[PDB]
Each structure stands twice: as structure tokens, then as C-alpha cells.
């Protein structure tokens, strides 16, 4: 019963190539918000987009459908240390503070 | 009634007081985490428990039960800085990676006087 669904569950990949991280909703959310795990297990927030896309570093995410029926997380120059465990979660009201959130994927970044 | 669900959904205590957080599973959960969302949205972890109890400061989690059906975090002597949304998680399938999240306790800490 996913209302959220993360793709893909787990990817290795080359360091320098890029790839994106997707996340499926079975129904328009207001928001989503991609994390990160620290080592201490914490989901460290990357971004949060209620549409249109965003930027930071390596990284860049859209939330640019009409539909907004997902969103996306591309990782582009992949290093050794961007391996981890990556979340996404979704946000059905404009304000609410409930998050739903996907399955998880875990990256291998190779040398 | 997904796999974990969190109650209460929401509460407001008086500074001072004491209430516990509730993470249900429904089934054995293999160990569960306790988090507490930033300002930023950042989910940080407050305990991983894969059995028994752990206390940090005010704070005090338990997995000890029907072994595995639910945890709790207590939080005694409430400070207006525990206000904020509480979530739990649970793995039962893999291993570390892919866990599964309660919807999130909104806790308001209320000042006294
Ligand atoms: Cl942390
Ligand atoms: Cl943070």
C-alpha cells in the first residue's frame, strides 16, 4: 500500500557520472522534501519544494509536473561520499506536519 | 492501518509535566528510532532501540514489551524547547536502509505561570 513510492530501492554508480533518484505519488501533493542520512542516522533535510526546482552543489531537484504526481533528485558528479541512504517524503496539505514517506534508496558511488 | 502508526497526532502539555509518545506496529519490528524534526525539517535522531530501554536527559524511550509491537518515548519535566513534531520508525525488512515512518506528533510545551 504505497501512497509514496521511491525509485530506484538501490543503485551503484561510477564516481563522476550523474543519476536521479525518483519519487512517485499515487495522488497531487502540496510538497515534498528530500533527505539524506548522517551516520547518526538522522535524516538531514536537502530540500523542500512546493514546486518549480532547486539547486545546491551537485545537487538539483524538481518538482516541476502539472500534475505533481512526482518529483525528482539528481545527484550529478558523484563522489565516494555522497554514498548513503536517501529519503523522500511527501506533504498532502499546504501546512500540514505530517510527512509520508517512500521506502528509502540506498547509493553506491564506486572509484 | 499501514505498519506503523504514531498517536496521539497531536498534544499540548503544561511545562512541567510528563506524557508519552506512542509508535504502534502491526507486527514484530526488528529495532525502531525516535527523531524529533528541526526547524530546517531535518528529521534528528534521539535513540535507536532494538530492545530494552535508553534514557538521555528527560528523555526516555522503550522498546521492552510484546516483544516488538510497539515503543514508546517518555518525556518528563516538559520544556517549551520539546515543542515540535516527534516521529518514530521501524525496520522490519532489510537491514539499516528502507525503514518504515510513523505520520508525525505535533507536541506544543506550554509556559506556566
Ligand atoms: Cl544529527
Ligand atoms: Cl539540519
Known amino acids: 500500500?504505497?501512497?509514496?513510492?521511491?525509485?530506484?530501492?538501490?543503485?551503484?554508480?561510477?564516481?563522476?557520472?550523474?543519476?536521479?533518484?525518483?519519487?512517485?505519488?499515487?495522488?497531487?501533493?502540496?510538497?515534498?522534501?528530500?533527505?539524506?542520512?548522517?551516520?547518526?542516522?538522522?535524516?538531514?533535510?536537502?530540500?523542500?519544494?512546493?514546486?518549480?526546482?532547486?539547486?545546491?552543489?551537485?545537487?538539483?531537484?524538481?518538482?516541476?509536473?502539472?500534475?505533481?504526481?512526482?518529483?525528482?533528485?539528481?545527484?550529478?558528479?558523484?563522489?565516494?561520499?555522497?554514498?548513503?541512504?536517501?529519503?523522500?517524503?511527501?506533504?498532502?496539505?499546504?501546512?500540514?506536519?505530517?510527512?509520508?514517506?517512500?521506502?528509502?534508496?540506498?547509493?553506491?558511488?564506486?572509484? | 492501518?499501514?505498519?506503523?502508526?504514531?498517536?496521539?497526532?497531536?498534544?499540548?502539555?503544561?511545562?512541567?509535566?510528563?506524557?508519552?509518545?506512542?509508535?504502534?506496529?502491526?507486527?514484530?519490528?526488528?529495532?525502531?528510532?525516535?527523531?524529533?524534526?528541526?526547524?530546517?525539517?531535518?528529521?534528528?535522531?534521539?535513540?535507536?532501540?532494538?530492545?530494552?530501554?535508553?534514557?538521555?536527559?528527560?528523555?526516555?524511550?522503550?522498546?521492552?514489551?510484546?516483544?516488538?509491537?510497539?515503543?514508546?518515548?517518555?518525556?518528563?519535566?516538559?520544556?517549551?524547547?520539546?515543542?515540535?513534531?516527534?516521529?518514530?520508525?521501524?525496520?522490519?525488512?532489510?537491514?539499516?536502509?528502507?525503514?518504515?515512518?510513523?505520520?508525525?506528533?505535533?507536541?506544543?510545551?506550554?509556559?506556566?505561570?
Open positions: 520508525a521501524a525496520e522490519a525488512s532489510s537491514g539499516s536502509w528502507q525503514l518504515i
Open positions: 532501540l532494538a530492545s530494552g
Open positions: 517524503a511527501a506533504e498532502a496539505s499546504s501546512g500540514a506536519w505530517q510527512l509520508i
Open positions: 519544494l512546493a514546486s518549480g
